[PDB]
Design a protein around this ligand. Structure first.
Ligand code: K
Ligand code: K
Ligand code: K
Ligand code: K
Ligand code: K
Ligand code: K
Ligand code: K
Ligand code: K
Ligand code: K
Ligand code: K
Ligand code: K
Ligand code: MG
Ligand code: MG
Ligand code: MG
Ligand code: MG
Ligand code: MG
Ligand code: MG
Ligand code: MG
Ligand code: MG
Ligand code: MG
Ligand code: MG
Ligand code: MG
Ligand code: MG
Ligand code: MG
Ligand code: MG
Ligand code: MG
Ligand code: MG
Ligand code: MG
Ligand code: MG
Ligand code: MG
Ligand code: MG
Ligand code: MG
Ligand code: MG
Ligand code: MG
Ligand code: MG
Ligand code: MG
Ligand code: MG
Ligand code: MG
Ligand code: MG
Ligand code: MG
Ligand code: MG
Ligand code: MG
Ligand code: MG
Ligand code: MG
Ligand code: MG
Ligand code: MG
Lengths: 116, 135, 52, 78, 177
RNA sequence: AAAGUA
RNA sequence: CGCGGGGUGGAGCAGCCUGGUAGCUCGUCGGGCUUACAACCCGAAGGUCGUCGGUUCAAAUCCGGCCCCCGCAACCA
RNA sequence: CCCGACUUACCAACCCGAUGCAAACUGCGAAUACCGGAGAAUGUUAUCACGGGAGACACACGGCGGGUGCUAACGUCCGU
RNA sequence: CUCCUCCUAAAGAGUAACGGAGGAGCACGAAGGUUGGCUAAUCCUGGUCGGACAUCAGGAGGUUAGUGCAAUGGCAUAAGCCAGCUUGACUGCGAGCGUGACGGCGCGAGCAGGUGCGAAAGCAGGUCAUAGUGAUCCGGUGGUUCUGAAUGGAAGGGCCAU
RNA sequence: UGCCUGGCGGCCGUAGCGCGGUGGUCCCACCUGACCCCAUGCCGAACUCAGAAGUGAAACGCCGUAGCGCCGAUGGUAGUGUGGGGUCUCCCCAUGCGAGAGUAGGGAACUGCCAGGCAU
């Protein structure tokens, strides 16, 4: 199963981040959409979030499942995080390769101001 | 003469023999010979009693042996002083009170009683005749 | 105990050396590794030589 | 005759050195073990021989956590 | 491509009418075609494996993968990791082109050919057949062969049983006996 | 040079 | 009993050490020389290695028992 | 000839059901003992550290838990 | 006769016998570091040579595999399998702790300098761990801002590495 | 406010299997192409990218159902600390602690944060 394989792929880094007590920037990717959440060190409270299923973000995109959409989501999540005053997170690729849409989101968040 | 076909280890600690038995019900036949005492049953004894039983019933019915001699017993040869554990010489089953040792089926109760008495005369432990119970 | 002792000698000319072992029958090629030289306080190339 | 046995190795003094609720200083060994019968929790490290040791001052806490019902040792800050 | 279009344009409706499927996604599909050569003589001369791989590459239009022993076997004098075979996996356009070539050219050229067995199904709708001589493939020149070589062909199908697998294969006019 | 027996 | 060494074509003996089908001499069989036999010449066959277990992908081989044989030792009062 | 067709004095692996055994078995698991914290009473500080002086390092039997021996020894070797 | 693993050993440690069983006196510049990826045995069915067992495909199964070498404790976030880049198998130190009669032996965050892998958080002071060993003396080799029997040197000595 | 879905957790079988049914507006999944970023020790299978014609078939989620797994008393039994006793290899008495297995029975999880869709 693809989902179980990816969860297995992500577990080691997630356990390391929990042990380090870091604030996570977790990314989730589907063929149609991309999502980003900033999660508190306890792992059960979401501080900010942004995705292409939000109207305010999706209305400005030709397609919600490509690198341009990924960059828009990264920029939006970084701006909301900076508005909340977070500024310091660790990237959680969630078992996806650091590449393509995931990398474009991360680069947009870095450019917008998140430190990771 | 029963004895394990193979074992993990050749020799065993003496140990002890406390407690009451597990396996106190006639489970396979209709009649049983049950131990009332505590002790060891050698393979030779088990087989001497089996022979006595079987000849008494004229090889009719069915007989189960509920105990198996899985404990090896070592001895030191004569005129030896230490120097390592002795050699395995025979095999025993440890018996606690309540242990059903043999069961019989397919024969009348009187004949089973006679056969079991002849068998018990070969054994070093006191025994008693039991019958199957519904519960 | 077929493995033989060898030294790895700094290329920085300081005389500093590390020591280790090597299976000379299976790997005749000289061992070469970048290691920290505490005399010049830099990582440099170190090359195999006889143990003495 | 003679015996082919007669050998043994020295006892390794493994086991739990600090039990639940004990106050420890950072660095203290909590358990010595072969492999991870106990696992490292919060503020605990696992050394190269799988010794669990305190990474902060505090009180020893044992718990059972996770999907495998594994045993973890952590240090509660005091 | 021709056989893929034939599938999508006749076989889907044929199978839907035959088996009363409620969804087009339920129709059996040709997942992949795998060609294998068990070159057990390479342990004496590895160059034989090279020749077999060249033949497989010529037959399939694809670079083959050398397959090694999973474990040491005393009976065949092979140690674990010994290269003893070569395989090719065909999907998509390459699969369809090879399927068409095999159906329309190579199979009729089989020596004493009288139809393929319909019992060569593994129970889950996948088909396996054995080609005794590679010369049946026109991509192999009969004059330059140094040694006759066979192979195994497996057609892996998304069918759920042998009946659906054979129906799908026969919809392409597979030369069953 | 080496050739026993019936 | 203790310490060693062994057991492999019909006989005597190699190979074992150090894991990947094992050989020599005599003997046997078929042919040849002879009136015939012997001697001699040519050709061929014959053992999964004492018996079991274990290790090993694989054991004549390494390890552990069991049987048989040989050589030393089994003593002081 | 390739096949095959029956039958077992039969032996029966795997699996299913039922019955036991284990120092070097454990999908369970005590009593005690041990480590740590808190509290009262009691106890000639009974505790720890440093320093002056030693003796001792052949132990015995009895109870309990055991190895060995024959669940032999006023036997032998540990634990308490 | 030293070392390692199990049991005896009485659910903390330790615990004897000419008690019961097995191993070591190494191996590896990758079999070490790191990043990314992956998941076993066995059986059934179909398939050229190919057979009980080679490679191929599917299914069952779920670690019954694997671990450089004994045994125990571990291991899926794998410590098991594959590949890229590499030298942290770094140098100076070290809060604190374990274990020893002692000589000693072990675990260790963190600090300074310099380094590898990673986008990054980070990881790396050898290897899944526990055997693979030998005090002191006497000398050998290299280094050295130490010493240098009147003085300058030198010899010899010290210190550091071996 | 309710229903549905996705992500991250708590918890770690009363929560997992099996069997039956059911869902596509959205979401998810399969899916459509691949010259390209990237990739196959062969293969766009996987990874990756560009998309949205089709389908809920598979997967997933939800609902139902004890054939299993799982949980599980009360009582009794085993063992056992201390003191006493016997016919002392083994037991009994007073007191304190008290299983394991099995029985009755339970049982088709519960829950926090954020986001989206629909009704309202
Ligand atoms: K199929
Ligand atoms: K005793
Ligand atoms: K005593
Ligand atoms: K113990
Ligand atoms: K490596
Ligand atoms: K590597
Ligand atoms: K010390
Ligand atoms: K000097
Ligand atoms: K002078
Ligand atoms: K000098
Ligand atoms: K359930
Ligand atoms: Mg006992
Ligand atoms: Mg018992
Ligand atoms: Mg030990
Ligand atoms: Mg004569
Ligand atoms: Mg004399
Ligand atoms: Mg206390
Ligand atoms: Mg003394
Ligand atoms: Mg003494
Ligand atoms: Mg004494
Ligand atoms: Mg004493
Ligand atoms: Mg006693
Ligand atoms: Mg007296
Ligand atoms: Mg005495
Ligand atoms: Mg006595
Ligand atoms: Mg203990
Ligand atoms: Mg104890
Ligand atoms: Mg003592
Ligand atoms: Mg002592
Ligand atoms: Mg001892
Ligand atoms: Mg030895
Ligand atoms: Mg990794
Ligand atoms: Mg200190
Ligand atoms: Mg630094
Ligand atoms: Mg970098
Ligand atoms: Mg080292
Ligand atoms: Mg390794
Ligand atoms: Mg190791
Ligand atoms: Mg001298
Ligand atoms: Mg002078
Ligand atoms: Mg001078
Ligand atoms: Mg795709
Ligand atoms: Mg469905
Ligand atoms: Mg009760
Ligand atoms: Mg209970
Ligand atoms: Mg369910």
């Amino acid at each position: 199963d693809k989902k179980s394989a990816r969860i297995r792929r992500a577990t080691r880094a997630r356990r390391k981040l929990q042990e380090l007590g870091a604030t996570r920037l977790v990314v989730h990717r589907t063929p149609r959409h991309i999502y980003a959440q900033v999660i508190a060190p306890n792992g059960s409270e979401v501080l900010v979030a942004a995705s292409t299923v939000e109207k305010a973000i999706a209305e400005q995109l030709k397609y919600t499942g490509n690198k341009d959409a990924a960059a828009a989501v990264g920029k939006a999540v970084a701006e909301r995080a900076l508005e909340k005053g977070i500024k310091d997170v660790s990237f959680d690729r969630s078992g996806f390769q650091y590449h393509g849409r995931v990398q474009a989101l991360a680069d947009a968040a870095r450019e917008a101001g998140l430190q990771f | 003469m029963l004895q394990p076909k193979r074992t993990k280890f050749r020799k065993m600690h003496k140990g002890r023999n406390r407690g009451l038995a597990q396996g106190t019900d006639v489970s396979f036949g209709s009649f049983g010979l049950k131990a009332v005492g505590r002790g060891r049953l050698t393979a030779r004894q088990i087989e001497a009693a089996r022979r006595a039983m079987t000849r008494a019933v004229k090889r009719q019915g069915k007989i189960w042996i509920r105990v198996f001699p899985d404990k090896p017993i070592t001895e030191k040869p004569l005129a030896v002083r230490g120097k390592g554990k002795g050699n395995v010489e025979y095999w025993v089953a440890l018996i606690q009170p309540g242990k059903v040792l043999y069961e019989m089926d397919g024969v009348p109760e009187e004949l089973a009683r006679e056969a079991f008495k002849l068998a018990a005369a070969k054994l070093p432990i006191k025994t008693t005749f039991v019958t199957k119970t519904v519960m | 105990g077929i493995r033989e002792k060898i030294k790895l000698v700094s290329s920085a000319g300081t005389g500093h050396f590390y020591t280790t072992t090597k299976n000379k029958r299976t790997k005749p090629e000289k061992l070469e590794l970048k290691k920290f030289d505490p005399v010049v306080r830099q990582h440099v190339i170190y090359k195999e030589a006889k143990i003495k | 005759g003679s015996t082919r046995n007669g050998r043994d190795s020295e006892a390794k003094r493994l086991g739990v050195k600090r039990f639940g609720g004990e106050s420890v200083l950072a660095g203290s060994i909590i358990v010595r073990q072969r492999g991870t019968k106990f696992h490292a929790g919060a503020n605990v490290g696992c050394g190269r021989d799988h010794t669990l040791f305190a990474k902060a001052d505090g009180k020893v806490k044992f718990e059972v956590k996770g999907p495998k019902n594994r045993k973890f040792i952590s240090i509660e800050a005091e | 491509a021709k056989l893929h279009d034939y599938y999508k344009d006749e076989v889907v409706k044929k199978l839907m009418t035959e088996f009363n499927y409620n969804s087009v996604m339920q129709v059996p599909r040709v997942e992949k075609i795998t060609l294998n050569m068990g070159v057990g003589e390479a342990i004496a001369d590895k160059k034989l494996l090279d020749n077999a791989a060249a033949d497989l590459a010529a037959i399939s239009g694809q670079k083959p993968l050398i397959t090694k022993a999973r474990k040491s076997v005393a009976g065949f004098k092979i140690r674990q990791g010994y290269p003893i075979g070569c395989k090719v996996t065909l999907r998509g356009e390459r699969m369809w082109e090879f399927f068409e070539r095999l159906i329309t050219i190579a199979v009729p050229r089989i020596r004493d050919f009288r139809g393929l067995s319909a019992k060569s199904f593994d129970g889950r709708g996948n088909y396996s057949m054995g080609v005794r001589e590679q010369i049946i493939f026109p991509e192999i020149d009969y004059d330059k062969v140094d040694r006759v070589r066979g192979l195994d062909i497996t057609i892996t199908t998304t069918a759920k049983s042998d009946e659906e697998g054979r129906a799908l294969l026969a919809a392409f006019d597979f030369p069953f006996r």
